[PDB]
């Protein structure tokens, strides 16, 4: 079945420009008339994409090309076909592309669309073939020479049958067929878009977002792919199986996905009608900064510049031990409210998710941290204070509140960061005949400081004569019993109340998570969140040699410069991957496309460390400019650059800088 084709000629590789093609819907969220910013694997605008063509040029030893080479897959592929006679028939994806590994085949064999994930012995020169029969003028599918064997097939889909037009056509290419292929978490994602065209070469400029086509659960590694094309045989192609063939005109183009940040416009029907590639050029940077497709004239420094980050790293001290929260909450006996029981929690990995998701808790109210944000915040001490009170008093356990319980039994600070759980305990903690095992302090001469336990037996003086410590008249014992009964009202029913205080210090992380750590890389512009401190930049091995039991150092501007990861205890240094705050000067997009770039606090000799570098630079004490041209004329300030420098779009027509 495998045949190595001959008679190909040599031709240098060709390239073209992708314009603004290749945008696809990155999710399935229901939208209408909104702009949305997202970092995902996209084809950069105006990329040099590779151009491949199946043709047979007229003349003696005319160029004869049938392009089906192996290509890398990397992080995903944008593919575009310009067709008239349907030469491109599909693809194969894999790593070895032999029976040693599994491979994916997506091929349209003129009767069906076939998708198969199997161990394939693919041919070195795989192809499909159509035969033209002169006598009845019929173009019929004749050859299928993709693989020589298929074993351990694990996925198979065959579409409903059809009969496709296989005729070799005359004229210009008439259909553009675009695909975006991704391999994410074992799922092969296919997005596609079909467009009528009329051209001989290149790609159309019109914008069209690709619509997600299919999501295949195949779970295979993909690093390489090959295009499957259909050739032609007829009485006009004498020769053997290797040489008796010709190529019907067709072209295809390959561009490569990479992590890019796009601003996408969703219209009233949710269709992506336009997009901005933030890192294409400063104008796109301004548009992404202002969250708008239209930007008015002015000077903006917050636009800055981004090479973007590559990957994210999460690190925490490696602790797997389970916390005893379940043991504490499921205990049989507790202390009283005046003797609130305190347990310290340290050296553990947390599981608050199940506690929050539990439906057996009457009141679960938190201050300082939201339950969703709690999983990603990292603590050094946990304090669990447990007691039991009647249901109506539960509302008194809250910051900045008064009442006998708050004043005399348990206090909370006005700057409390922590959360409170309380839930009904009528059956377990109440019984007939009264309960004298839970009491409360009702009478004392002052309030309590926050987090202060007291079990004093000082006899309260309620009259005008000292008791001297002996029970008498108007002489009250400070503690009184609730006397819970199971037949009373809901307000009198006992309730278990616990408070979790998340004590944060400047100390090594102790109990945090639950989230798995990730391998560490350096010398790359990445996102990171060390112990709950989040940043974007490049991590380098630099030494400041600070103190033991220190975690971060700060500059004058109060931004983190040094970090100490837990699993290594290494002194990493943070460097911003930008060139600093760079200012853009614009006269408005709807008026002109020329812009000026001011590198504040930057010399013109550092700029080279899209305008690549200085070509005609004016230097002021405010910085370097590349777009504005000096004139000896003086005019009223229109856009004040600063330091006596003002700019405007004036005479030719260009942005010029002047000094009144």
């Amino acid at each position, epitope marked *: 079945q495998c045949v190595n084709l001959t008679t190909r000629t040599q031709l240098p590789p060709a390239y073209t420009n992708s314009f603004t093609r290749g945008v696809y819907y990155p999710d399935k969220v229901f939208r209408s008339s909104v702009l949305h910013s997202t970092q995902d694997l996209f084809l950069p605008f105006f990329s040099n994409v590779t151009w491949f063509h199946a043709i047979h040029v007229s003349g003696t030893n005319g160029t004869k090309r049938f392009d089906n080479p192996v290509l890398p897959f990397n992080d995903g592929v944008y593919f575009a076909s310009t067709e008239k006679s349907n030469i491109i028939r599909g693809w194969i994806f894999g790593t070895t592309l032999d029976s040693k590994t599994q491979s994916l085949l997506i091929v349209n064999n003129a009767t069906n669309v076939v998708i198969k994930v199997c161990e394939f012995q693919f041919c070195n020169d795989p192809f499909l073939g159509v035969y033209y029969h002169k006598n009845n003028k019929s173009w019929m599918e004749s050859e299928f020479r993709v693989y020589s064997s298929a074993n351990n097939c694990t996925f198979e889909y065959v579409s409903q049958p059809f009969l496709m037009d296989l005729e070799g056509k005359q004229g210009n290419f008439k259909n553009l067929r675009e695909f975006v292929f991704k391999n994410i978490d074992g799922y092969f994602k296919i997005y596609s878009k079909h467009t009528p065209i009329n051209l001989v070469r290149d790609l159309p400029q019109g914008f069209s977002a690709l619509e997600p086509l299919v999501d295949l659960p195949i779970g295979i590694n993909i690093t390489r792919f090959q295009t499957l094309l259909a050739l032609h045989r007829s009485y006009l192609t004498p020769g053997d199986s290797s040489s008796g063939w010709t190529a019907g005109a067709a072209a295809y183009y390959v561009g490569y996905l990479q992590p890019r940040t796009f601003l996408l416009k969703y219209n009233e029907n949710g269709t992506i009608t336009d997009a901005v590639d933030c890192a294409l050029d400063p104008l796109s940077e301004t548009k992404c900064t202002l969250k708008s497709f239209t930007v008015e004239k002015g000077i903006y420094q917050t636009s800055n510049f981004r090479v973007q980050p590559t990957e994210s790293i999460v690190r925490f001290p490696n602790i797997t031990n389970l916390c005893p929260f379940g043991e504490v909450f499921n205990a049989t006996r507790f202390a009283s409210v005046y003797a609130w029981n305190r347990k310290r929690i340290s050296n553990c990995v947390a599981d608050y998710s199940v506690l929050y998701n539990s439906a057996s808790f009457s009141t679960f109210k938190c201050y300082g941290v939201s339950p969703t944000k709690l999983n990603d915040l990292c603590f050094t001490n946990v304090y669990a204070d447990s007691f039991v009170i009647r249901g109506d008093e539960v509302r008194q356990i809250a910051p900045g509140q008064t009442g006998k319980i708050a004043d005399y039994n348990y206090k909370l600070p006005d700057d409390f960061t922590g959360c409170v759980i309380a839930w009904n305990s009528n059956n377990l903690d109440s019984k007939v005949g009264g309960n004298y095992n839970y009491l409360y302090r009702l009478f004392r001469k002052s309030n309590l400081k926050p987090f202060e336990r007291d079990i004093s037996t000082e006899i309260y003086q309620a009259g005008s004569t000292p008791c001297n410590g002996v029970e008498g008249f108007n002489c009250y014992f400070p503690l009184q019993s609730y006397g819970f009964q199971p037949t009373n009202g809901v307000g009198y029913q006992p309730y278990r109340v616990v408070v979790l205080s998340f004590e944060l210090l*400047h100390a090594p992380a102790t109990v945090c998570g639950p989230k798995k750590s990730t391998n560490l890389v350096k010398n790359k512009c990445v996102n990171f969140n060390f112990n709950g401190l989040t940043g974007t930049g490049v991590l380098t091995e630099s030494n400041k*040699k*600070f*103190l*033991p*039991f220190q975690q971060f*150092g*700060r500059d004058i501007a109060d931004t983190t410069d040094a970090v100490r990861d837990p699993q290594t205890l290494e002194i990493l240094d943070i460097t911003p991957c930008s060139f600093g705050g760079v200012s853009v000067i614009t006269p408005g997009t709807n008026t002109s496309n020329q812009v000026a770039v001011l590198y504040q606090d930057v010399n013109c000799t550092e700029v080279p460390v899209v305008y690549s570098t200085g070509s005609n630079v004016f230097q002021t004490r405010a910085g370097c400019l590349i777009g504005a041209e000096h004139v000896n004329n003086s005019y009223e300030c229109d856009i004040p650059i600063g330091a006596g420098i003002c700019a405007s779009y004036q005479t030719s027509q260009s942005i010029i800088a002047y000094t009144m």
Partner: antibody
Amino acid sequence: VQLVESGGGVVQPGRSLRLTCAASGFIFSSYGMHWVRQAPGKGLEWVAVISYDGSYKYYADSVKGRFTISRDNSKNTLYLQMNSLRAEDTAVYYCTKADYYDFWSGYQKTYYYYMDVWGKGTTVTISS
Amino acid sequence: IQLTQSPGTLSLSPGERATLSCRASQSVSSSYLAWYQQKPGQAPRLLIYGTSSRATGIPDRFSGSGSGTDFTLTISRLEPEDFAVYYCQQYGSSPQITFGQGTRLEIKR
């Protein structure tokens, strides 16, 4: 490399004083600082610590929350405010820099911490 | 954390071995320790850190050993410049580091 202390003298019990420490011969923005005192005819005693930038300042529990430490990197100067001064603090004060020897281990970073250079120090006398 | 020294006082003649002991009330790592000296009316100077290494510019006679909670400083030969007070210090089990009590190492005749 050396350091100098200044501000010592005579103070009534209950007043406030500012001790100053200066350094010369090394980069002042790459190391922390310790204040350690010695009582007359007694052993050494920890007082205070300040990091390189001013984001970590602990204190000894015996003087917890009383003394305040500060530094100015530009002038290469270190200031110590004494508030709520007691009559026990009559002693000698030394300002010193922290240093450590680095060692690599299996996926670890071991530090041998110590103090290397000590100034002549300044005396403080507390009597009514 | 606090430490204790042994002996309370020491008096030996020049040219013999000297041994000082530092004991802990709580387990510490044997790489987190140091030994300093102090002669009267002079700033204290580093002698040993890490119980196994030496500081720059100090002769070989100073040495250290020990682990757990028992630590030992050793001197082979004694010259007139070794006659001063000695301190043992932990500086890695932080905060609130503490020093030793103080040993006088004088001459007996």
